[PDB]
Design a protein around this ligand. Structure first.
Ligand code: MG
Lengths: 10, 99, 273
């Protein structure tokens, strides 16, 4: 299962 | 543009005339990712070509594979032609079966 | 040990709409899943037979994750333009690699969660899985934000938890292909040059996994700067190939040795023409 950005942006 | 593609054209198995095989065009170490790859038989585009195995080296350069099924013959000429921003014109690289 | 790794790329293309967004997943050196926003009906797709075992809920969940991810990368690409004071007319790239290296006994060796912008390091989760290394001043802005938000904590949780657990499941389900060790079959070819000397080419064929070293020696010295060495390459049958070559004097071939190291080779090979 892959990774989630969780809407945490740069 | 930043990194020029490195192109290898080769078969899955050592080629034997009349034995089914796979012709591979593996293109590595390039950036940006946009790229166009065609495999050619006797100068004509081969219609059944698939792309696979996209990855990064990290230092992040792109890698990608084009491949097609083929049966080697004494008379057919194969090549892979690659167009990338880093090159003024598309680069055509021929299959060398005697390495 | 084994690895589960996801390689993610978002690339802008002003004038042609939304950035292209792609994810590709690997167990060790085997591609097994892929997402491409440019596909007819973009969804997570199987790329190895053994994953096709997974039910609809898996594909739906992974497609959802990809789509949420896609949205954040769209935002990030726009933010990047601001950080670097770049025009909105040009194409730019954001890359993203995350995954876990895991011993066969389930122990986590190393977790990765790292980014690059336009081909260069941007920000990377350190080995401690707690702090970040920022490559430039723009990335320091990101670091401060992610430190404030405690971003590393949930990332760490994935790397130590889901990443490890699913890797184990994949290795079990795909064992007939994934657990193989195929040693290199190696040999040296001899090519006389018109110049009157010789190219020796050391070949390694049919090996898995892909990690390998191929080196030429003369009188105990490695010929690093002299050799031509190609990138390790897929044969398209689950195995890999590589070659290294040197140019040597006619009649002195025998002085040169090729050395092959691979997990399938308890003792490395030494080959001599
Ligand atoms: Mg750089």
């Amino acid at each position: 299962r892959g990774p989630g950005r969780a809407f945490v942006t740069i | 543009i930043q990194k020029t593609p490195q192109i290898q054209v080769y078969s899955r198995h050592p080629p034997e005339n009349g034995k089914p095989n796979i012709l591979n065009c593996y293109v590595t170490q390039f950036h940006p990712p946009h790229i166009e790859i065609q495999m050619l038989k006797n100068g004509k585009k081969i219609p059944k070509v698939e792309m696979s195995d996209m990855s990064f080296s990290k230092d992040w350069s792109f890698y990608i594979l084009a491949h097609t099924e083929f049966t080697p013959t004494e008379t057919d000429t194969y090549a892979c032609r690659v167009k990338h921003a880093s090159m003024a014109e598309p680069k055509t690289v021929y299959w060398d079966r005697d390495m | 040990s084994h690895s589960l790794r996801y390689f993610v790329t978002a690339v802008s293309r002003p004038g042609f709409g939304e950035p292209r967004y792609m994810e590709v997943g690997y167990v060790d050196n085997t591609e097994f899943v892929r997402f491409d926003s440019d596909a007819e009906n973009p969804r997570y797709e199987p790329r190895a037979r053994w994953i096709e075992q997974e039910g609809p809920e898996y594909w739906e969940r992974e497609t959802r994750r990809a789509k949420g991810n896609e949205q954040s990368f769209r935002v990030d690409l726009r933010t990047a333009l601001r950080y670097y004071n770049q025009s909105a007319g040009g194409s730019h790239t954001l890359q993203w690699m995350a995954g876990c290296d895991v011993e066969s006994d389930g122990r986590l060796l190393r977790g990765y969660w790292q980014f690059a912008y336009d081909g260069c390091d941007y920000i990377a989760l350190n080995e401690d899985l707690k702090t970040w290394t920022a490559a430039d001043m723009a990335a320091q802005i990101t670091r401060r934000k992610w430190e404030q938000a405690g971003a590393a904590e949930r990332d760490r949780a994935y790397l130590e938890g889901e990443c490890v657990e699913w890797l184990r499941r994949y290795l079990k389900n795909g064992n007939a292909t994934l657990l193989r060790t195929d040693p290199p079959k190696a040999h040296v070819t001899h090519h006389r040059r018109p110049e009157g000397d010789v190219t020796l080419r050391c070949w390694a064929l049919g090996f898995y996994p892909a990690d390998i070293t191929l080196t030429w020696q003369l009188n105990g010295e490695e010929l690093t700067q002299e050799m031509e060495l190609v990138e390790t390459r897929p044969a398209g049958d689950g195995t890999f190939q590589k070659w290294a070559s040197v140019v040597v004097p006619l009649g002195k071939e025998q002085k040169y040795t090729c050395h092959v190291e691979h997990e399938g080779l308890p003792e490395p090979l030494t080959l001599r023409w």
